Write a protein that binds this DNA or RNA. Structure first.
Ligand SMILES: [Mg+2]
Ligand SMILES: [Mg+2]
Ligand SMILES: [Mg+2]
Ligand SMILES: [Mg+2]
Ligand SMILES: [Mg+2]
Ligand SMILES: [Mg+2]
Ligand SMILES: [Mg+2]
Ligand SMILES: [Mg+2]
Ligand SMILES: [Mg+2]
Ligand SMILES: [Mg+2]
Ligand SMILES: [Mg+2]
Ligand SMILES: [Mg+2]
Ligand SMILES: [Zn+2]
Lengths: 77, 140, 39, 103, 64, 193, 135, 136
RNA sequence: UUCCGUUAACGAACGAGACCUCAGCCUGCUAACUAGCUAUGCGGAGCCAUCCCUCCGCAGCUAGCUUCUUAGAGGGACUAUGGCCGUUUAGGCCACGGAAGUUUGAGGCAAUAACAGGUCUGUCAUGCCCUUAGAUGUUCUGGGCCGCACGCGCGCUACACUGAUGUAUUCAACGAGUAUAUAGCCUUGGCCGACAGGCCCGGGUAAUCUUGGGAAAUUUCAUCGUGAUGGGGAUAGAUCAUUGCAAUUGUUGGUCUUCAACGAGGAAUGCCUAGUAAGCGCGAGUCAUCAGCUCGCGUUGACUACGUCCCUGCCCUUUGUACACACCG
């Protein structure tokens, strides 16, 4: 995916990952990582490693940030 | 009357634990063992603790110091030093049958806690860059 | 401008420790200098 | 009147050297001086590696030459003339001694 | 439809192969413990090893 | 038995069951002496024959990541990758990822192979069996290389690549490099039977 | 204390501390330099002149008699010479010089006779307080 | 939020791409590299986490000013790439198209002069004292 | 060709082994203010603060200190112990113990006979020839050894996300340092400078000062997100300083810019069996400066095998030979 080049295109910053895509992407197992799903939602990284930051202040999922910036996902609890 | 100062060794890292009959405290170079800093090799440091348990440490303080070596060498030297320091403290100040349980808990999991590892970086011989390899060889 | 103390040639010198002798003269006289070859 | 003196003592051979070390320690302790030693000080390893060929043909073969220089130091508390009363005993070949007057 | 069958290596007879790389062993069958067959085995194999075995009625011959 | 020993303190070794009684001996997960907290150990292995058969299976999978030159010699990175893969396996299947590791190694070890025997004076390749230790060797190697190349020049990173290969090889689907190479070797050997 | 605090979070906390605990002078070349010859870009953080100072604070904390060259060496790194083999390369002098001069100007550290930089007692007070105020 | 997100900006006759960071899109100009892009971003005081495409018009004017008149920003003489000219003797940053012209002026001096280096270029082989048995 | 044993042989001489060096074990001995613990005495800072407790600083008639460091003497392993195989001989495989059970690991040294192997360019080592003043002698100047259509060899850097970049974090070993004149070889410390590098006080002929080597890889947090991109650093321009009596065919090192090929490499081929391969840095040699090399050193640290004579070769015996400059016959 062209997912940091596409960062400013208004679709992403308007509705795509604002619990419209990565609300259901976690739901396959009810927890499927953002870094795992970097390609299941084909969208690559850093338009994704920033939207994870957005979703953490949006308070919808838990976070696990570690060595190679391996970050994770959890849908609702 | 407790005071033991026992060491453990790796490639070149040497770890020395000097003790007091204290309360629970464990420090490496003044930094708590909690701040041992390979944070993936942070298990092996606690592992002699985690096998014996804090209950075998409510009466001891360990101002363990480590010099020379690398990183993982120093961590494994920690492991050996604290294991042998606990065994020696128990043997000389608790009971030999009491230390025998520590002996067996440690040795059942692994022998390398208590026995130094005689491996060293063996020297490099001419005719190559490397202690056992050679240069790539050309005929034509 | 610098040669062996021994043969007075201009290559293969051993400057270290101030010998001022070449690699050939040095071996030729090495055992009496005292460079016991333990290994 | 009773001053502090250093003796430093080096060599090439351990077997030769230790005989001198036992020599001076017993020389002092026959006359009850205040001595401390013989401090053993880490061995210098002089080394020169040379291509053992003289022309540079055949498989590259190096040989490693080494001297081992051994350093010993002893402190005595006595007057320097009392020191010269000791250090006129026989000194073994090859060993070097460099008595100096310190603080 | 062969059902993969099991054996234990009772002794390692030898080490055949052009490059000496196929152990030749003598296996005993678990499911009926009177069938003993000489087979070829590759890699490190010691006594008492259990081997899965896709096809059973092939056997090797001494110093194959 | 005595098993209050969890690797990384959080993935209980207990209640793991190996299907193959063949690989039961050579998988270091069952005995109370094979449990370890970390898949890093400065083990004096390979100093004797078969001594690696008692290496912890997680450690003996860890050593196989650190390959291809730029990665030779760094086990800290390897164990970091193992930790992340192991937690992501849990975060998908919510089941013992140790059992996932073991079951994958069971289900991706070639049981037959065609090598280069000569007999009667004439040499040509034929089918032979696979001793369980070499079963495990090829399983480890052949699961690992799939992750390596499937993550090469790929934004998906190695922890999730290897997690995908493990989950799917253990599940049994032929969507992993590992189990794809398995039946290829199996079919070459079956043809050459 | 600071030996009890995780070495990174103490640096973060002190970096914020020498921002909000008063202020000082600061050179007008900070947003230019690479802080080392082998580096390739200037630090990606804006208050790098402050995280640097937080680190160099605890260096004189836990070690004494450190000169400018000791910091040059400690803050060097790997220099990739291009097609040449890489080496070890010492860091820059002026950046560490002005960190030490800034900390001296707040009296946290000071130049010792016989040479080197040593902490002062009230700087010790400050570092221990900020260490204690960390989780 | 790219209501006017631009895919190529086209400053300085290079088609600077409007899809990568401004940090490393301004490097596409032939005469401004990785470091000098950063120093321009700093001195023109533009937000840093900003992909080209989202950026505003007044600040392309600011970049214009700071790239053709950098010195007035008290920037030292030693980011500049034409230190101590001998055509005239000033300190300037050459920009995209003019860099080839400046290089031709250099080599064209060398041609008129019969400098060893000028010939060596005209001859085509390596100019800096390098071997040429086995390379090139 | 190690031994048992057989035995027209007997008794021997080398090589092997034995020997020496390094490394690994010793809470056993000798000691060590040029090594380092340990305790107390004050100091500094955190604190139920008043003491205590944690971490640092400094000093001693502190040790009924030498575990860590050093280096001497020693001790230790012998297959010693047990099982199995073996003429129950020589030995082998296994197991407890133990630091060590491929002679424990690695080297040093290393036999007879030979090569038309290399070296007359290491040598006041050299025979014969040539030269020997208008010199192939010696000294100086400038150039050359580096030239480039190209082919080959040893290597370095990579082709990236197991990554690059930028912060934070902190761990060794081997060694090295001429009167080097008016402080001078390693350079600590203060200052100026973005850098490069300058100035001043000095320390060390050295377990004393450098360095108690504050090395990198790696670790941690962010930046780049698969794009020949922020991988790559080839090429080339501008300029700055040091070494040098001299920098041009850029000695070197900086600064900005220039941003190539290279998508893991055909036929083939090399090195390697445990702290080994490989990755990572340091020191030494060369040196006025130049280290991609060579020799040492440590750091992180594996997969595979414990085999076979299939390929290349080696040793013994038998056999065949029209070979002996010996199958390149
Ligand atoms: Mg990846
Ligand atoms: Mg030997
Ligand atoms: Mg000859
Ligand atoms: Mg001349
Ligand atoms: Mg040449
Ligand atoms: Mg070579
Ligand atoms: Mg780059
Ligand atoms: Mg050099
Ligand atoms: Mg050379
Ligand atoms: Mg070959
Ligand atoms: Mg004939
Ligand atoms: Mg023929
Ligand atoms: Zn000579």
């Amino acid at each position: 995916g062209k997912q940091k080049e596409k960062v400013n295109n208004a679709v992403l910053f308007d509705q795509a990952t604002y619990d419209k895509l990565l609300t259901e992407v976690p739901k396959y197992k009810q927890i499927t990582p953002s870094v795992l799903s970097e390609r299941l939602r084909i969208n690559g990284s850093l338009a994704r490693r920033a939207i994870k930051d957005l979703m953490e202040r949006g308070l919808i999922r838990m976070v696990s940030i570690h060595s190679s910036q391996q970050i994770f996902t959890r849908a609702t609890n | 009357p407790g005071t033991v100062q026992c060491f453990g060794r790796k490639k070149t890292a040497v770890a020395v634990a000097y003790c007091k009959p204290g309360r629970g405290l464990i420090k490496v170079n003044g930094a708590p063992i909690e701040l041992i800093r390979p944070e993936m090799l942070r298990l092996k440091a606690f592992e002699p603790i985690l096998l014996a348990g804090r209950s075998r440490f409510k009466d001891i303080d360990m101002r363990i110091r480590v010099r020379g070596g690398g990183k993982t060498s120093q961590i494994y030297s920690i492991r050996q030093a604290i294991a042998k320091s606990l065994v020696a403290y128990y043997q000389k100040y608790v009971d030999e049958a009491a230390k025998k349980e520590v002996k067996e808990i440690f040795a059942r999991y692994d022998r390398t806690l208590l026995v130094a590892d005689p491996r060293r970086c063996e020297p490099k011989k001419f005719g190559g860059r490397g202690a056992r390899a050679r240069f790539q060889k050309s005929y034509r | 401008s610098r040669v062996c103390r021994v043969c007075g040639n201009s290559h293969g010198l051993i400057r270290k420790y101030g010998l001022m002798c070449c690699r050939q003269c040095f071996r030729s006289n090495a055992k009496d200098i005292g460079f016991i070859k333990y290994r | 009147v009773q001053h502090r003196i250093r003796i430093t003592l080096s060599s090439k051979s351990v077997k030769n050297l230790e005989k001198v070390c036992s020599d001076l320690v017993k020389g002092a302790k026959e006359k009850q001086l205040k001595v401390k030693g013989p401090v053993r000080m880490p061995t210098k390893v002089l080394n020169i590696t040379t291509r053992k060929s003289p022309c540079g043909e055949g498989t590259n073969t190096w040989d490693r030459f080494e001297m081992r220089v051994h350093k010993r130091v002893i402190d005595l508390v006595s007057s320097p003339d009392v020191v010269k009363q000791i250090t006129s005993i026989t000194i073994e070949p090859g060993v070097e001694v460099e008595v100096t007057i310190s603080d | 439809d062969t059902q993969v069958k099991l054996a234990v290596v009772v002794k390692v007879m030898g080490r055949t192969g052009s490059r000496g790389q196929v152990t030749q062993v003598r296996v005993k069958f678990l499911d009926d413990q009177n069938r003993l067959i000489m087979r070829n085995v590759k890699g490190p194999v010691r006594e008492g090893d259990i081997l899965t075995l896709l096809e059973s009625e092939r056997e090797a011959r001494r110093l194959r | 038995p005595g098993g209050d020993v969890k690797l990384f303190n959080r993935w209980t070794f207990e209640d793991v069951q190996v299907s193959d009684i063949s690989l039961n001996d050579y998988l270091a997960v069952t005995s109370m002496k094979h449990y370890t907290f970390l898949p890093h150990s400065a083990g004096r292995y390979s100093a004797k024959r078969f001594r690696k058969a008692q290496c912890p299976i997680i450690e003996r999978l860890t050593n196989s990541l650190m390959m291809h030159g730029r990665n030779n010699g760094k086990k800290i990175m390897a164990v970091r990758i193992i930790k992340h893969t192991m937690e992501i396996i849990h975060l998908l299947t919510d089941a013992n990822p140790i059992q996932i590791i073991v079951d994958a190694i069971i289900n991706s070890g070639p049981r037959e192979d065609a090598t280069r025997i000569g007999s009667a004076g004439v040499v040509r390749r034929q089918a032979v069996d696979i001793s369980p230790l070499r079963r495990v060797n090829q399983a480890i190697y052949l699961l690992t290389t799939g992750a390596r190349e499937s993550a090469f020049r790929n934004v998906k990173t190695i922890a999730e690549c290897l997690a995908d290969e493990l989950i799917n090889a253990a599940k049994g689907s032929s969507n992993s490099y590992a189990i794809k190479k398995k039946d290829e070797i199996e079919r070459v050997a079956k043809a050459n039977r | 204390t600071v030996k009890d605090v995780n070495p990174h979070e103490f640096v973060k906390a002190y970096s914020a501390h020498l921002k909000r605990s008063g202020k000082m002078e600061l050179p007008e070349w900070v947003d230019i330099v690479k802080t080392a010859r082998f580096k390739e870009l200037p630090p990606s953080d804006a208050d790098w002149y402050y995280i640097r100072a937080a680190s160099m604070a605890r260096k004189i904390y836990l070690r004494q008699g450190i000169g400018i060259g000791g910091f040059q060496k400690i803050y060097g790194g790997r220099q990739r010479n291009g097609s040449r083999p890489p080496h070890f390369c010492k860091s820059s002098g002026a950046v560490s010089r002005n960190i030490l001069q800034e900390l001296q100007k707040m009296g946290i550290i000071d130049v010792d006779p016989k040479g080197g930089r040593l902490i002062t007692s009230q700087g010790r007070r400050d570092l221990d307080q900020v260490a204690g105020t960390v989780p | 939020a790219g209501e006017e997100f631009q895919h190529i900006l086209r400053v300085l006759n290079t088609n600077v791409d409007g899809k990568q960071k401004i940090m490393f899109a301004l490097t596409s100009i032939k005469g401004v590299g990785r470091r000098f892009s950063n120093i321009v971003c700093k001195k023109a005081d533009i937000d840093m986490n900003k992909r080209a495409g989202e950026l505003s018009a007044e600040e392309m004017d600011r970049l214009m000013a700071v790239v053709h008149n950098p010195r007035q920003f008290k920037v030292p003489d030693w980011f500049l790439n034409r230190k101590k000219d001998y055509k005239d003797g000033r300190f300037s940053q050459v920009v995209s198209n003019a860099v080839d012209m400046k290089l031709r002026d250099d080599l064209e001096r060398l041609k008129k002069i019969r400098n060893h280096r000028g010939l060596r270029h005209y001859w085509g082989v390596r100019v800096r004292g390098q071997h040429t048995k086995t390379t090139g």
